[PDB]
Amino acid sequence: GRVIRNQRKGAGSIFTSHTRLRQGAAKLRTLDYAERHGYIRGIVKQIVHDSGRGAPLAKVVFRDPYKYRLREEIFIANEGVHTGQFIYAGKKASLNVGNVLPLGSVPEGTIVSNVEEKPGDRGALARASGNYVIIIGHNPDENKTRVRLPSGAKKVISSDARGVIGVIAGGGRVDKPLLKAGRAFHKYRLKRNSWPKTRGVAMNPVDHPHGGGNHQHIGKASTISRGAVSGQKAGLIAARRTGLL
Template structure:
């Protein structure tokens, strides 16, 4: 005995599809950034004995642009023959001599341990742990300030305004990252914004869920009241973990009881 499918009886339901955030979670090439165009990672060289005891001389070989990075990047060649890439502080030029090490002078572009940098100096590309290559204050126009030295470590004022204790052996570059004011310039054309977002691998353009059709998003359709609760488990997998994560309530304000 054959069973007739529900679609032939006119009761076939129109199913929705995965929303854009869930499709991005797959990690396919459609949503991946173009990392093959990038020049090199920005990080300090591995710490040598000569760098710890004195200073290693170097020279700025070239200043280049790295796709997806707002700040300019410089390739620096050391006297040992090693070449490393670093973000460029304001005032650094091609052919400029640089130093890296504990005995280096406190000049713009030189790299020193935080424990050897005087208080009030503006620094950038700061390591969080000795030898990690630099993690803090690397975007265009960013800088941190050395506030003071304590037995617990060096107090650094971060670009956010908060302060943090950092190990004295962590290295930092003296100066302010070049390219300040980059975000203040308008894009003027949607194409310019498109190419920036493509280089960074960001989603563009962003569409409101309520502006979509019902099949594309839970908030979609012209019905304003048909919204689904977005509370999800904290242990939800990527793609499903969207909205109110492990929320205690649905986000609505509770009415106060009148006495």
Template structure:
């Protein structure tokens, strides 16, 4: 009987949780319609790769959204179905022209944003298809979303964050700590058999299949979890 894996140990200890003070606010699109808001501050969040914009609505409500490039303190943002194509404005996908760059895109209407939320990322509205809209994601993949999902106009701020080298291990340690990630990490194939399902052997390799079921227990749930396909991709012959 082996030891518990790293994922099992992390799940039972409160020391692996992110400190609450590292989250100034949640990055979610507020559930409002046909309202105007004013940017009162741009907030740095150690747990986010893009800055957050603190906005205040006309009725005094305060919210935080991911700040696109080009917005500034004092700028007014519009929320609704008919807004100008200006960075920071939030509207439905059905109201956005084709070819527009958008960020913080909702997967389902009202969920607050799920896609293109990392610093410097953006998606592009490709085409409309009735009650669906096709979006090109930052990865280049195409995704069909409901037309009444919302998105923020513009490219998310924080571009170029990966261009500056970390220089020393301490910088990598604090960057991982801000997100509640383990650092440094050891690959499973470098461990002993009692420490990880991929461990052991005369060379570092996964000996056997590395695909596991979605319902696998925590000690076994490592590798490719319920993959849609495995193996080397094949190109079609013309």
């Protein structure tokens, strides 16, 4: 048989991301003495757009303490920040939107974004548009902190891990229909080559497990296993269930 599309996706010839017009990798400030003990102030200069991304970014300028110079970080903007705003980042920072704090300092019930799975990760969770995590409780002994993620899962992580207050901007982006193939074309033009998607049923047997037949059908049971391997995993990888909910 042939090698199939998902197997070809791993080499990364024509499936690499399209990264020319991206403003830069969005990240939090590196964990330093200031963020660990007190706070530090920066100025948000520009609220800007990032190609291939629905959420906007913010350019935040901070003052290097060890040398006389300026350092520009690229944050993911939360809903409500504005140019000329002061962003306070650290342990002793106040509880306002856009500020960066550790999860142990804040109380439970608060809303944060761009959370680090571990301290020094510089942003892992709640980065897409309209997304947020909710702190539900702390455990100061054994220092840990329990959070709820956008998928609904509940996790426990270090209280020294950081996050930025508020909701990521750009919400509602998926409530608008596209109505046209051209808008999907231009959307994925800047993300990657995962569009259009031909159906495996419409191919020959060399090209897919689902291919073949005088009628467009699958010969079996679209729930594949998890111990399957590299050419068998067509659809519904490890389905605990199927059907409408």
